Point group: C2
Chain length 182, copies 2
């Protein structure tokens, strides 16, 4: 039961890179494939362009009644139908991290409705949130979404809605890595 | 600016071990000294007995008005007179970590008054909170306190008040390493 996940862009992996969109700030080099490994990488293989890593952690903002709503409808990863995925690494500004817990919760849910908006796109979209600021990585979060092609248009709508939120005014680096399951 | 810290119990270090208290659950081996290093150490040196590590992280529970109170009084580390120190690794239960953010905040402060009680022992006591559950370590937190002998009795009071709090019903492993600055 290891909470560390690595994402290595390169020639090998379980996922074909469809495209990479460098939304904001320095991007990620285009590669053929992404290899996802659970655990800490011993040595990065040859012909790898980049390595991202993060860990699964405890809830930081969601309250019990939100967790109950998410749990009632959120799908599992690895659904046979979920052949599309998107890896989105995200970095938030130093202004964000300086803020107190009540100030960040108010932006996250009261002003931006992150959980309420996201719930609109379940059960179509499965997700996994990983943290990596505390590892000294270049991003603060590795977010992961997977879904069937039927939900691609919906997911693209969700992305536009989130980037218009107050919360995203604190995002200062973002890349979309679009993937297809091999 | 590396946020990782390592505490190596052994025969070298900047701190002499006065005593080790095996408060709850498996203890830590008694050693002569503790060595504190900033950064991640990959090879523990020979005739060291244990290594603890954690990182400095963002605020998880404190609200803005509590941060302002803490900042008004909390003392710096490495005060000339702060020749005593206590390193207290703590592990919380699986039931704690499964709880939602509002549930944990209400136990932490509304019921246990962690911050309000701690502020009573400032500015005598300087402190540093490190996290390590997300590193896969045996403990969840490494807490560090340092003060002059004048505040030894006050700090021992604080410990007894905290161990009787609702929050401590979720602690399942705890060790006190009492130190003296060399
Ligand atoms: C698909 C529906 C989604 C749902 C149901 C959802 C739900 C959530 C929840 C409940 C959290 C808080 C976890 C906690 O309390 O620690 C969270 C965090 C986060 N989500 Fe989402 N989310 C969705 C989509 C997205 C998308 C599309 C993105 C990025 C484009 C995203 C980026 C993030 C980030 C960066 C965080 C961490 C926030 C922080 O800790 O500051 N989420 N999400
Ligand atoms: C000396 C006065 C103290 C003050 C002013 C104080 C203040 C605080 C504050 C404000 C936090 C929350 C940090 C955040 O929001 O992320 C915290 C966390 C914590 N403190 Fe203290 N504290 C004190 C003493 C102690 C003592 C003596 C112990 C152990 C015996 C302790 C154990 C912890 C633990 C384990 C956490 C992490 C709680 C969690 O995230 O679940 N504290 N402290
Ligand atoms: O909900 N962001 O993984
Ligand atoms: O307040 N725990 O360092």
């Amino acid at each position: 039961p290891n909470n560390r996940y690595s994402f290595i862009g390169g020639r090998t992996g379980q996922w074909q890179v469809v495209k990479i969109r460098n939304v904001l700030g320095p991007g990620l080099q285009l590669v053929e494939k992404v290899n996802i490994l659970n655990g800490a990488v011993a040595e990065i293989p040859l012909d790898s362009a980049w390595r991202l890593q993060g860990f699964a952690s405890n809830i930081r903002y969601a309250i019990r009644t939100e967790l109950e709503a998410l749990q009632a409808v959120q799908p599992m990863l690895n659904r046979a139908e979920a052949i599309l995925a998107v890896l989105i690494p995200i970095k938030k500004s130093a202004q964000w991290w300086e803020m107190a817990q009540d100030e960040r919760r108010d932006i996250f849910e009261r002003e931006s409705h992150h959980t309420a908006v996201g719930l609109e796109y379940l059960p179509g979209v499965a997700r996994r949130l990983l943290h990596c600021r505390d590892l000294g990585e270049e991003f603060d979060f590795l977010t992961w979404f997977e879904f069937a092609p039927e939900h691609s248009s919906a997911f693209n709508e969700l992305l536009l809605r989130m980037r218009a939120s107050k919360e995203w005014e604190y995002v200062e680096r973002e890349v979309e890595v679009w993937l297809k399951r091999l």
